Amino acid sequence: GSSGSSGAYPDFAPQKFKEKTQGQVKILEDSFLKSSFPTQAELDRLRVETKLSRREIDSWFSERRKLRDSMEQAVLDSMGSGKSGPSSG
């Protein structure tokens, strides 16, 4: 474990965001596979373990469901954003 939990903060990391590491994903799958919607306690262990943040995971799980739904009849919320910067994007 660590002295302090994993939390966001105002700083510039010299390393760019990398794809989800096998280990991390594996840790999440174990939880998700069991319960799509993790509990405070669960997630808490997910972030620290996978070394990710609430938002970070939020995406993984959010999408993970889409795969399970299989384009089935289910109510969902609406959202849309626009991000730019790098070339060919």
Find out whether 15 and 57 touch, Cβ atoms under 8 Å. Answer: no
> In Å, how far are 56, 60, 80 from 20, measured between CA atoms?
10, 9, 23
- The count of other CB atoms within 10 Å of the CB of residue 28 is 23
Q: What angle do CA 13, 22, 76 make, to 5 degrees?
A: 85
Q: Which experimental method was this entry solved with?
A: NMR
Interatomic CA distance for residues 38 and 27, integer angstroms: 12
Interatomic CA distance for residues 64 and 67, integer angstroms: 5
For the range 66-74, what are the long-range contacts, defined as Cβ-Cβ under 8 Å and sequence gap of 24 or more?
Answer: 68/36
Closest CA to 24 of 45, 40, 4: 45
Find out whether 27 and 49 touch, Cβ atoms under 8 Å. Answer: yes
Q: DSSP readout, 35-46?
A: -SS--HHHHHHH
